[PDB]
Nucleic acid binder design. Structure first.
Ligand SMILES: [Mg+2]
Ligand SMILES: [Mg+2]
Ligand SMILES: [Mg+2]
Ligand SMILES: [Mg+2]
Ligand SMILES: [Mg+2]
Ligand SMILES: [Mg+2]
Length: 212
DNA sequence: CCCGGACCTGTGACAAATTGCCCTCAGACGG
DNA sequence: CCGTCTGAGGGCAATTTGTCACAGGTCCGGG
């Protein structure tokens, strides 16, 4: 009943490492850009706080640190690499931020597409669970269900999981179980899965889901 | 044969990072 | 001018995320 995010599958499937707060800002950029090619977006502290139920102070802290942490971050489309920002962010007015997204990213944002309402993701905390929920939406049916098999090496490459999750028991305990639990507790989706094996190695995860 | 070895699992510890909270004080504005 | 609503700073303890040692399973093959 809330803003409807839509994005090219190329972003859903891109390789990058962003925090929760950065991904939150990124949804509004994609929304602003889409409602129109200069790459200039803006974020208001007082509106961000209302959208995500934060105080003005903690809103200010999240934006500021998110913004300075974009520096040096890059995005790869499988491959081709780009910087997100081509100028530091800056504040012309108190409570207002202005940002310069790489105009070469515009066609990767708007294209074979993914869509969800912002209320679906705004309570998720772990950013890897946000990645997972975006990739499942890419396969959702009008009625709200789907089934998809994701390869483990591709999950590790695209979501840029940290090195110790290449050991399968650590992958299970700290990524897979936590993110399925968040989705089931924080979104209107109800998710289950099963592991596919080849010899002793586990190679894919097969996800099934329906809507509440 | 049958050991050492190369694989695989899960769990207990600890280290590093993130969470929502709390308090201070100056900016912008309007009555 | 000043009182109030903001937000830009400085911090906190409680949880979560990231890493690795060690117990305990299987199957393989040469000396
Ligand atoms: Mg992280
Ligand atoms: Mg925060
Ligand atoms: Mg023995
Ligand atoms: Mg093996
Ligand atoms: Mg025992
Ligand atoms: Mg043994």
């Amino acid at each position: 009943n809330s803003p409807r995010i839509v994005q090219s599958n190329d972003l859903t499937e891109a390789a990058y490492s962003l925090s929760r707060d950065q991904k939150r800002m990124l949804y509004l950029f994609v929304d602003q850009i889409r409602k129109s090619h200069d790459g200039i977006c803006e974020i208001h502290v007082a509106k961000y706080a209302e959208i995500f139920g934060l105080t003005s102070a903690e809103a200010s802290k999240d934006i500021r640190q998110a913004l300075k942490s974009f520096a040096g971050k890059e995005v790869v489309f499988y491959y081709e690499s780009f910087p997100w920002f081509i100028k530091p962010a800056h504040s012309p007015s108190r409570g207002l931020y202005s940002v310069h997204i790489n105009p070469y990213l515009i066609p990767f944002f708007i294209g074979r597409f993914t869509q969800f309402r912002l209320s679906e993701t705004k309570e998720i905390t772990n950013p890897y669970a946000m990645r997972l929920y975006e990739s499942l939406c890419q396969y959702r049916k009008p009625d709200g269900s789907g089934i998809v098999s994701l390869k483990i090496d591709w999950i590790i490459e695209r979501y840029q999981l940290p090195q110790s999750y290449q050991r399968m028991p650590d992958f299970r305990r700290r990524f897979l179980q936590v993110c399925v639990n968040e989705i089931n507790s924080r979104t209107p989706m109800r998710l289950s899965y099963i592991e596919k094996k080849k010899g002793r190695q586990t190679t894919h995860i097969v996800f099934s889901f329906r809507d509440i």
